[PDB]
Design an enzyme around this catalytic site. Structure first.
Site, mmCIF file in Angstrom:
data_model
loop_
_atom_site.group_PDB
_atom_site.id
_atom_site.type_symbol
_atom_site.label_atom_id
_atom_site.label_comp_id
_atom_site.label_asym_id
_atom_site.label_seq_id
_atom_site.Cartn_x
_atom_site.Cartn_y
_atom_site.Cartn_z
ATOM 1 N N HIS A 1 0.854 -1.196 0.000
ATOM 2 C CA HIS A 1 0.000 0.000 0.000
ATOM 3 C C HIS A 1 0.893 1.251 0.000
ATOM 4 C CE1 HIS A 1 -3.264 -2.744 1.014
ATOM 5 N NE2 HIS A 1 -2.612 -3.151 2.096
ATOM 6 N N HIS B 1 5.554 6.117 6.951
ATOM 7 C CA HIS B 1 5.247 5.691 5.588
ATOM 8 C C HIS B 1 4.872 6.958 4.779
ATOM 9 C CE1 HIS B 1 1.283 5.767 7.516
ATOM 10 N NE2 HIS B 1 0.903 6.263 6.348
ATOM 11 N N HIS C 1 2.493 8.776 1.232
ATOM 12 C CA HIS C 1 1.429 8.749 0.253
ATOM 13 C C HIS C 1 1.920 9.690 -0.877
ATOM 14 C CE1 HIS C 1 -1.498 6.885 3.174
ATOM 15 N NE2 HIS C 1 -0.736 7.522 4.049
ATOM 16 N N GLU D 1 -2.387 13.615 1.393
ATOM 17 C CA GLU D 1 -3.734 13.252 1.808
ATOM 18 C C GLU D 1 -4.533 14.503 2.286
ATOM 19 O OE1 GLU D 1 -3.507 9.407 4.049
ATOM 20 O OE2 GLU D 1 -4.465 8.903 2.206
ATOM 21 N N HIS E 1 3.740 10.355 6.876
ATOM 22 C CA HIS E 1 3.104 10.161 8.157
ATOM 23 C C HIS E 1 4.016 9.398 9.077
ATOM 24 C CE1 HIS E 1 -1.072 10.108 6.024
ATOM 25 N NE2 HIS E 1 -0.684 11.345 6.316
ATOM 26 N N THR F 1 -6.205 6.767 7.879
ATOM 27 C CA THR F 1 -6.657 7.009 6.477
ATOM 28 C C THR F 1 -6.685 5.707 5.655
ATOM 29 O OG1 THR F 1 -4.447 7.627 5.563
ATOM 30 C CG2 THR F 1 -5.769 9.367 6.547
ATOM 31 N N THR F 2 -6.523 4.555 6.325
ATOM 32 C CA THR F 2 -6.660 3.221 5.642
ATOM 33 C C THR F 2 -7.472 2.358 6.570
ATOM 34 O OG1 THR F 2 -4.608 2.385 6.719
ATOM 35 C CG2 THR F 2 -4.327 3.470 4.517
HETATM 36 C C1 LIG Z 1 -0.158 3.187 4.038
HETATM 37 O O1 LIG Z 1 0.068 1.826 4.412
HETATM 38 C C2 LIG Z 1 -1.223 1.265 4.639
HETATM 39 C C3 LIG Z 1 -1.000 0.003 5.450
HETATM 40 C C4 LIG Z 1 -1.842 -0.006 6.696
HETATM 41 N N1 LIG Z 1 -2.094 1.319 7.241
HETATM 42 C C5 LIG Z 1 -1.174 1.756 8.103
HETATM 43 O O2 LIG Z 1 -0.064 1.244 8.182
HETATM 44 C C6 LIG Z 1 -1.367 2.959 8.956
HETATM 45 C C7 LIG Z 1 -1.696 4.143 8.333
HETATM 46 C C8 LIG Z 1 -1.792 5.275 9.135
HETATM 47 S S1 LIG Z 1 -2.136 6.754 8.543
HETATM 48 N N2 LIG Z 1 -2.302 6.666 6.939
HETATM 49 O O3 LIG Z 1 -1.051 7.685 9.058
HETATM 50 O O4 LIG Z 1 -3.534 7.167 9.071
HETATM 51 C C9 LIG Z 1 -1.595 5.126 10.493
HETATM 52 N N3 LIG Z 1 -1.297 3.924 11.065
HETATM 53 C C10 LIG Z 1 -1.176 2.811 10.333
HETATM 54 S S2 LIG Z 1 -0.806 1.256 11.027
HETATM 55 C C11 LIG Z 1 -0.618 1.542 12.687
HETATM 56 C C12 LIG Z 1 -1.735 1.825 13.481
HETATM 57 C C13 LIG Z 1 -1.554 2.038 14.857
HETATM 58 C C14 LIG Z 1 -0.278 1.966 15.415
HETATM 59 C C15 LIG Z 1 0.851 1.666 14.631
HETATM 60 C C16 LIG Z 1 0.671 1.458 13.262
HETATM 61 ZN ZN LIG Z 2 -0.626 7.410 6.088
#
Ligand SMILES: COCCCNC(=O)c1cc(S(N)(=O)=O)cnc1Sc1ccccc1
Ligand SMILES: [Zn+2]
Length: 247
Positions: free
Chosen positions: A62, A89, A91, A101, A114, A188-189
């Site tokens: 992703h 990560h 976007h 985003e 992010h 956002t996912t």
């Molecule tokens: C973009 O990769 C998508 C894979 C899954 N989504 C996330 O990793 C993810 C995305 C966000 S974001 N786009 O900043 O809103 C935040 N946390 C997490 S995964 C996560 C959640 C809680 C604690 C640690 C990691």
């Molecule tokens: Zn993100």
């Protein structure tokens, strides 16, 4: 689940599940003149951000993601407690006007970074720091280890090790991070949990256009390498009853 772009060749964003159809979702447009200045919002303190580490980065299908393993944390910033860093990560897209985003007064940036942190043991269990990325003429050398690593991780489930680098190497100078916006929102996912205190920094990171383009040129969403990884961006959600504030 997938992004709109992947469907043009799965569950597109308007069809996501989980909490993604709730009422306090991210990302959003920030109308800057409407964000009231708030005196409680102080500078951030970064811990472990200056430290040179060899990070591991993976293509998870992703995005591309660095595992931060509690090796850095933050406090200040209006946060109620310290939060430990878990993963960074990005976007992005492949146009100067189309890959962040969040947007600021309607303008999108070419990427958004992010850094996801978690409250050290409801609405604010997760602190995400969002940085906007735009074109500059200069190669951002600080970003070179990440950019260089991308050619080793073209398909999902691949990982690689970066050359020595710090989180600060990826960021605008610390004195320029005093101006930020803040609001309560969601991941956002999927499952799009409404548990994030969002910070979006006003000062963008500057990258060479070809450092930006290198994400779309080198990465693919799928093993078969039929869809270049780009436009991994959730569409804008409404502010609704919420307000945005700024430091
Ligand atoms: C973009 O990769 C998508 C894979 C899954 N989504 C996330 O990793 C993810 C995305 C966000 S974001 N786009 O900043 O809103 C935040 N946390 C997490 S995964 C996560 C959640 C809680 C604690 C640690 C990691
Ligand atoms: Zn993100």
């Amino acid at each position: 689940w997938c992004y709109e772009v992947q469907a043009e060749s799965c569950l597109v964003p308007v069809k996501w599940g989980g909490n993604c159809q709730k009422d306090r979702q991210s990302p959003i447009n920030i109308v800057t003149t409407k964000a009231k200045v708030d005196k409680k919002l102080g500078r951030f303190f970064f811990s472990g951000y200056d430290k040179k580490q060899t990070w591991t980065v993976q293509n998870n299908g992703h995005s591309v993601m660095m595992l931060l393993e509690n090796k850095a944390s933050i406090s200040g910033g209006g946060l109620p407690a310290p939060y430990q860093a878990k993963q960074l990560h990005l976007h992005w897209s492949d146009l100067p006007y189309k890959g962040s985003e969040h947007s600021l007064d309607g303008e999108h940036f070419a990427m958004e970074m992010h850094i996801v942190h978690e409250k050290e043991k409801p609405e604010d269990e997760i602190a995400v720091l969002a940085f906007l990325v735009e074109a500059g003429t200069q190669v951002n050398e600080g970003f070179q280890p990440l950019v260089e690593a991308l050619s080793n991780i073209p398909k999902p489930e691949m990982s690689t090790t970066m050359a020595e680098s710090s989180l600060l190497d990826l960021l605008p100078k610390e004195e320029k991070l005093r101006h930020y916006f803040r609001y309560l929102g969601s991941l956002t996912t999927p499952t799009c949990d409404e548990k994030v205190v969002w910070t979006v920094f006003r000062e963008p990171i500057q990258l060479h256009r070809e450092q930006i383009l290198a994400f779309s040129q080198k990465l693919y969403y799928d093993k078969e390498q039929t869809v270049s990884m780009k436009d991994n961006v959730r569409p804008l959600q409404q502010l609704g009853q919420r307000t945005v504030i700024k430091s």
